[PDB]
Amino acid sequence: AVGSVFLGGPFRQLVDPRTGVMSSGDQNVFSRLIEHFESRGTTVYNAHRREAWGAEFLSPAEATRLDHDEIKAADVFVAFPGVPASPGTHVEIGWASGMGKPMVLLLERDEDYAFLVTGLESQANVEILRFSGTEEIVERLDGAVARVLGRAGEPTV
Amino acid sequence: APAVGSVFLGGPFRQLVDPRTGVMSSGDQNVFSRLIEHFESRGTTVYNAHRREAWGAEFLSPAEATRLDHDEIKAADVFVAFPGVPASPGTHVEIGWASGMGKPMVLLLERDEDYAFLVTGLESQANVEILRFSGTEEIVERLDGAVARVLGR
Ligand SMILES: Nc1ccn([C@@H]2O[C@H](COP(=O)(O)O)[C@@H](O)[C@H]2O)c(=O)n1
Numbered sequence: 389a390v391g392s393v394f395l396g397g398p399f400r401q402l403v404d405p406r407t408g409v410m411s412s413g414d415q416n417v418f419s420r421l422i423e424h425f426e427s428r429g430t431t432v433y434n435a436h437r438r439e440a441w442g443a444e445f446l447s448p449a450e451a452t453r454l455d456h457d458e459i460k461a462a463d464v465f466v467a468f469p470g471v472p473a474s475p476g477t478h479v480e481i482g483w484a485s486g487m488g489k490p491m492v493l494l495l496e497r498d499e500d501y502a503f504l505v506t507g508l509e510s511q512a513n514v515e516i517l518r519f520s521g522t523e524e525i526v527e528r529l530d531g532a533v534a535r536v537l538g539r540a541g542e543p544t545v
Numbered sequence: 546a547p548a549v550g551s552v553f554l555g556g557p558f559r560q561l562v563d564p565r566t567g568v569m570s571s572g573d574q575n576v577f578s579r580l581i582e583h584f585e586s587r588g589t590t591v592y593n594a595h596r597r598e599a600w601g602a603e604f605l606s607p608a609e610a611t612r613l614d615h616d617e618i619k620a621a622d623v624f625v626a627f628p629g630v631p632a633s634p635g636t637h638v639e640i641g642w643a644s645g646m647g648k649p650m651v652l653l654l655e656r657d658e659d660y661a662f663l664v665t666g667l668e669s670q671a672n673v674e675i676l677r678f679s680g681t682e683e684i685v686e687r688l689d690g691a692v693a694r695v696l697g698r
């Protein structure tokens with residue numbers, strides 16, 4: 389029941405400078421979430437896959453425009469803010485919250501996140517999904533997406 | 546040049562609070578204070594969390610901080626911020642709020658340090674001017690010109 393999702397998360401910090409690409413492992417976490425949605429026929433926008441995991445980077449101007457456009461187009465925004473913080477994902481969190489996009493933020497359990505990320509709870513249309521592994525995310529994500537989509541339009545601060 | 550009514554000043558906060566004392570260092574408070582005074586002495590109202598929260602001694606809750614910052618950014622004529630090295634998580638959220646609402650922005654980038662693609666990419670896709678700097682005096686000398694240019698659009 390979800391037409392499209394934008395999936396965000398750390399990119400630069402995950403690129404191995406020796407290889408110019410994200411590891412198999414980091415690619416796998418994003419790929420699990422991408423396939424989770426795509427298997428239901430949902431369109432998934434994701435820069436990491438788009439840019440061949442770091443091998444075919446866009447220019448900063450192109451990356452920025454395309455990401456904003458894809459977030460605007462998508463029904464829901466799902467993202468890992470990152471530990472340490474992903475600068476681009478944090479910009480994206482600002483774009484999405486500022487435009488009233490339904491959001492699911494994937495936060496590592498027992499890690500500290502920014503005041504301006506956790507403070508979005510109850511003030512933007514956001515659900516926080518704390519996780520201790522990728523399987524937990526896969527198990528809980530559909531419920532969280534459905535809830536924030538169900539709230540789209542409810543007034544928020 | 547356009548009249549400048551108000552500025553929201555952002556930058557690293559958590560990473561600058563000395564865990565030994567619970568407050569920002571003198572040197573760090575001074576950077577923000579100089580920029581605040583720069584604007585206020587020129588008739589411009591300044592919104593700034595660092596001063597508001599007593600340099601770390603009087604933090605707001607995450608919810609209050611988030612709401613107040615978003616509201617003050619929405620209110621302000623221009624957004625001026627240090628994205629930080631290393632990146633300030635909250636300032637990057639604020640950069641997203643400001644760019645997303647089409648706010649005139651001046652981003653203060655340390656010269657010869659690397660910043661994010663989605664920050665430098667704003668230079669051409671949003672109403673932003675990047676001001677690279679090697680010291681506080683350079684920022685103070687160049688800020689009015691940068692503000693005038695973004696406010697003019
Ligand atoms: N080359 C890049 C770098 C970041 N980004 C966007 O910003 C986020 C990652 O930011 P970082 O590289 O700063 O961690 C991703 O969610 C992605 O959408 C991008 O689309 N292309």
Ligand SMILES: Nc1ccn([C@@H]2O[C@H](COP(=O)(O)O)[C@@H](O)[C@H]2O)c(=O)n1
Pocket residue numbers: 502503504554555556557558559560593594595598604605610611614633634635636639
């Ligand atoms: N307690 C806090 C923490 C962050 N912030 C906002 O976010 C930025 C700082 O983010 P960090 O603390 O993540 O570096 C500032 O520009 C400030 O406006 C705040 O207003 N109050």
